[PDB]
A paper describes a structure:
UGPase is an enzyme ubiquitously distributed in all types of organisms and catalyses the formation of UDP-glucose, the key precursor of the sucrose biosynthesis and cell wall metabolism in plants. Among the various enzymes, UDP-glucose pyrophosphorylase (UGPase; EC 2.7.7.9) is important and essential in this carbon regulation, whereas the sugar, UDP-glucose, represents an important branch point in the C channel directing for synthesis of starch, sucrose or cellulose. To better comprehend the regulation and activity in the reactions involved in the saccharide metabolism, UGPases from different types of organisms have been characterized over the years. It is known that oligomerization plays a role in the regulatory process of these enzymes affecting their function and activity. Recently, the UGPase from sugarcane (ScUGPase-1) was characterized, showing that the enzymatic activity and regulatory mechanism are similar to those reported for other UGPases.
Author numbering: 13 to 45, 50 to 72, 76 to 261, 264 to 476
Write the structure that this text describes.
Amino acid sequence: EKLDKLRAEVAKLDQISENEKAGFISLVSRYLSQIEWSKIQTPTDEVVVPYDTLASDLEETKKLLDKLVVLKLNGGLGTTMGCTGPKSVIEVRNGFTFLDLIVIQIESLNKKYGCSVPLLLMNSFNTHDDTQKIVEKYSNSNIEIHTFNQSQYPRIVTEDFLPLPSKGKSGKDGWYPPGHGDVFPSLNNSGKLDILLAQGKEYVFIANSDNLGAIVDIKILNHLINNQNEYCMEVTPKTLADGGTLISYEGRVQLLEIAQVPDEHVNEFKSIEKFKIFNTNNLWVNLKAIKRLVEAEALKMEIIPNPKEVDGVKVLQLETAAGAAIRFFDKAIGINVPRSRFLPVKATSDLLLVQSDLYTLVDGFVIRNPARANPANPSIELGPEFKKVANFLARFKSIPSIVELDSLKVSGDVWFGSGITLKGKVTITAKSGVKLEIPDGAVLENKDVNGPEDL
């Protein structure tokens, strides 16, 4: 029994709590111990509710908001985009970080309705101390901000299936936060869940701190209160560029990810024709239901292995997803929302969009320029030279105007001046060894640039 050998070594660790050891051992048990395609059903409009059908007063809206807590997933670092510290503290636009804008937006909500919707940041051991220091700057803000630290699990050395860390030794490299599905046991273990319940809060709105579209939506909250759904996942129509989908399966809604799709149906799953929606990671969950299901040990989400290398040594990081929890909640639904609620910043190409003239900031909210009639955003592709935020900023003296852009692709050592306008289809391909400069004031429209001769 490899399970006993691992549980015994986990028990000797002194860096994490007994609750965390038990949760990790549980994940390992499921990992060590596929959907039936013919049973999958497309959700009806009663199971995935189109946003246009939602039922449309300051004081009554306060009564709704008084039941809400806003939780932002803040356990991840800015590594992908070349930044240290929490991903949420990268600057988005006009010097404001993701977390800055979240705070201003809740301040706006509190002012308009005379409420105090609490903000709860779910940190990880990778972000918690920095976030504690950072949230000192909101001390004078019209907001109640709290934080908690999610679970800390040991990485598993793949070769011998033993924990990487050891008793009484430091080192972040030995550990990992076990995904966003951990929000539910962590809300409980940290004590925040009992406090929220005791305060009369009833629903938590969960979202990634890097989704600029994930604002509190009164119509959605109103629907949940009126119909007592225990869980609502916001989905949005699939495009070619898109993720897990909601299905009806054995009489209730559940998330389906490609990992659970048998090989012979992966192409049908990946197609655009059968599944029309995907999960935005905007989640609304009933707090009493979480407590019930955490205490019943019912939240047995699919294990996501997420393997990694620590100084070239292969490790396992067993994780779970927050969206996968939906199949355990009663009266669970999807809501199919417009894509304006799905604006994740995952790459510097997304920063280009939000920092451009395509958007502006209005009281903390990211507002799309109405002069772009096309509701689709331009496609933007940049080479690895632009991967890191600082390098992306250096290579754009100003952000080009892209209101009329269809698509931009840039590769090679390219440096943009200021005051540039891009229209239609623009490709810029700097050949090997060429440091290509796009001049100040350039207008590029339906143009392929392959060298200085094209400028």
